[PDB]
Q: What sequence folds into this?
């Protein structure tokens, strides 16, 4: 399960957009993703940074995430795209605790 944290989070995000009847336009996807990333902690907050969706993150990367989302690119494929930048995105694991 390469990219598993990333894949599940993006699928959760997709499902939220669908369930809330949100338009898949670029600006909307961008704001919604930044919003979805707001209350995140730990590994999910690190993922949000790798997605371009935290204050200290790269909007260049945010564009690389939200443009594929506008055509409903499968989450695994978005994650695999980002892995080529910084591979740690696909290596994340939640605390074993």
A:
């Amino acid at each position: 399960a390469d990219c598993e944290v990333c894949k599940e989070f993006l699928n959760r995000f997709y499902k939220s957009l669908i369930d809330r009847g949100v338009n898949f336009s670029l600006d909307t996807i961008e704001k919604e993703l930044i919003s979805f990333c707001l209350d995140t902690k730990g590994k999910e907050n690190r993922l949000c940074y790798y997605l371009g969706a935290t204050k200290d993150a790269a909007t260049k990367i945010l564009s690389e995430v939200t443009r594929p989302m506008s055509v409903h690119m499968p989450a695994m494929k978005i994650c695999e795209k980002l892995k080529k930048l910084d591979s740690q995105i696909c290596e994340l694991k939640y605390e074993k605790t």
Summary: Residues 1-97 form a domain with the NK-Lysin fold (CATH 1.10.225.10). The chain has one domain: 1-97. DSSP finds five helices and no strands in the chain. The radius of gyration is 12 Å.
